[PDB]
């Protein structure tokens, strides 16, 4: 169900992304509200695009984890934490990660173009 | 910065596409303006879609260069001209290039379907 996994562990909750994705889209202020919802959806889709993840719910990149952002092990993060707690713990780093993701995709696109250029 | 590379050469400008793309989304008349901006964004996304380029900013295709559109050499185009000059240079050929890209992607998708059919 929609947000049913909100209190579940991050690992289990990763299997419910489909429901929230479908639930992001579902008088002047009603039209304004619909336009704002569309703008937020498109900003998120463009942000995934710049990361090379436009077609996936889960995508891996080449950006390493700093470990200063969070020094918890994968077992603690995925089994003993909720997504709300995780979001709070890295609230000060999210835009840095976003910048690194954009730079990584730019390097991947240029490297891919150069590899394709070879005969 | 936004359009900061506008006066730079095409090669240098190709490295700043991310900032310009991210800033494209950023009583009744302003709501109409927001809807129009969204429609133009989606038109561009759909044009990339039908060409098979929806997932990236730099998308190489299988359409060869005609050389009648512009007979400048590769070095001249990328190292001397700016993107405004390039847009003027081929302003009369855009409707042909887009059609060829559409046909090329259609043939590519049909070929992929035929290749997947092989046991």
């Amino acid at each position: 169900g929609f947000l049913g996994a909100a209190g579940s562990t991050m690992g289990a909750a990763s299997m419910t992304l489909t429901v929230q994705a479908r639930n992001l889209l579902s008088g002047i202020k009603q039209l304004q509200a619909r336009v704002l919802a569309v703008e937020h959806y498109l900003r998120d889709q463009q942000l995934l695009g710049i990361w090379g993840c436009s077609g996936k719910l889960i995508c891996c990149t080449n950006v390493p984890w700093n470990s200063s952002w969070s020094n918890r092990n994968l077992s603690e993060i995925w089994d003993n934490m909720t997504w709300l707690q995780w979001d709070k713990e890295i609230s000060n780093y999210t835009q840095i990660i976003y910048g690194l993701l954009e730079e990584s995709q730019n390097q991947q696109e240029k490297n891919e173009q150069d590899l394709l250029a070879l005969d | 910065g936004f359009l900061g590379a506008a006066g730079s050469t095409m090669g240098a400008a190709s490295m700043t596409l991310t900032v310009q793309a991210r800033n494209l989304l950023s009583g009744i008349k302003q709501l109409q303006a927001r809807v129009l901006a969204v429609e133009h964004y989606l038109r561009d996304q759909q044009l990339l879609g039908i060409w098979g380029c929806s997932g990236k900013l730099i998308c190489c295709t299988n359409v060869p260069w005609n050389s009648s559109w512009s007979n400048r050499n590769l070095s001249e185009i990328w190292d001397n001209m700016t993107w405004l000059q390039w847009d003027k240079e081929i302003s009369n050929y855009t409707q042909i290039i887009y059609g060829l890209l559409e046909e090329s992607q259609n043939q590519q998708e049909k070929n992929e379907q035929d290749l997947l059919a092989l046991d």
């Epitope: 240029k110 490297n111 150069d114 250029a117 005969d119 | 090669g11 190709s14 590769l74």
Partner: antibody, heavy 123, light 106 residues
Framework: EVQLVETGGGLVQPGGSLKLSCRAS????????MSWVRQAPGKGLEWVSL????????FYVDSVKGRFTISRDNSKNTLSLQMHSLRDGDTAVYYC??????????????????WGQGALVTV | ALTQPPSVSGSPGQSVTISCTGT?????????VSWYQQHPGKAPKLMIY???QRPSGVSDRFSGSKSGNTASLTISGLQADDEADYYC???????????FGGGTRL
């Protein structure tokens, strides 16, 4: 116009590691791809490795891929080749050269043009 | 590898052809066959690149040729300073980038 100077080791025991570093004048490293090509002591030239203008991509012959790494630092205008395992079939004069590829915004080169004086590596 | 004659015998007033033969797939597909002149004791100098192109600093007496799965360097007006080991090299694609032959002493 362009000068390539290589600094590195000489006779080294088998099983160790060496780093051969090429410095150059006359061009910016970030604008050109560069390679390492070696002269067999008694025969001709063999290409060893090629690195892209930006340094993002590295290529090797299969006979060296497991022993040689090509690396670039544009800020220091330094190209380097790190070699490991040091099989005694690696004795050669190693030359630093420019070219070998492009980034598709310049006409493809697919040849080497400027050459250094090389360094003799023995094992 | 590419084949190449171990040596040729030039003389004043004559033209000499230095041949090179490789795999027909790599040579025919990739028309990037260059020639270098390696003076004894010195690094190789690029003399010819592409089938018919020449770099700055090399006079017109040096000219490349390609046919079938073979290529050659033709030199006329041989000078005393031209007596060096010539090498051919060709692009082999993405799995192997370059194929080299041996040296030909003038």
């Amino acid at each position: 116009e362009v000068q390539l100077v290589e600094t590195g080791g000489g006779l080294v025991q088998p099983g160790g590691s060496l780093k051969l570093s090429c410095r150059a004048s006359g061009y910016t490293f970030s604008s050109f791809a560069m390679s390492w090509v070696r002269q067999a002591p008694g025969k001709g030239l063999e290409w060893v490795s090629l690195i892209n203008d930006r340094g993002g991509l590295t290529f090797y012959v299969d006979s060296v891929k497991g022993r040689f790494t090509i690396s670039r630092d544009n800020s220091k205008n330094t190209l380097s080749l790190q070699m490991h395992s040091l099989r005694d079939g690696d004795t050669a004069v190693y030359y630093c050269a420019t070219g070998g590829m492009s980034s598709a915004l310049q006409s493809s080169k697919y040849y080497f043009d400027f050459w250094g004086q090389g360094a003799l590596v023995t094992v | 590898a590419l084949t190449q004659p171990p040596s040729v015998s030039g003389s004043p007033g004559q033209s000499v052809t230095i041949s090179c033969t490789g795999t027909s797939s790599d040579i025919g597909s990739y028309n990037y066959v260059s020639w270098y002149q390696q003076h004894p004791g010195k690094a190789p100098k690029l003399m010819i690149y592409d089938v018919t192109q020449r770099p700055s600093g090399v006079s017109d007496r040096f000219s490349g040729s390609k046919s079938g799965n073979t290529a050659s360097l033709t030199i006329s007006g041989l000078q005393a300073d031209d007596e060096a080991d010539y090498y051919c090299s060709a692009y082999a694609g993405r799995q192997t980038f370059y194929i080299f032959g041996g040296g030909t002493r003038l």
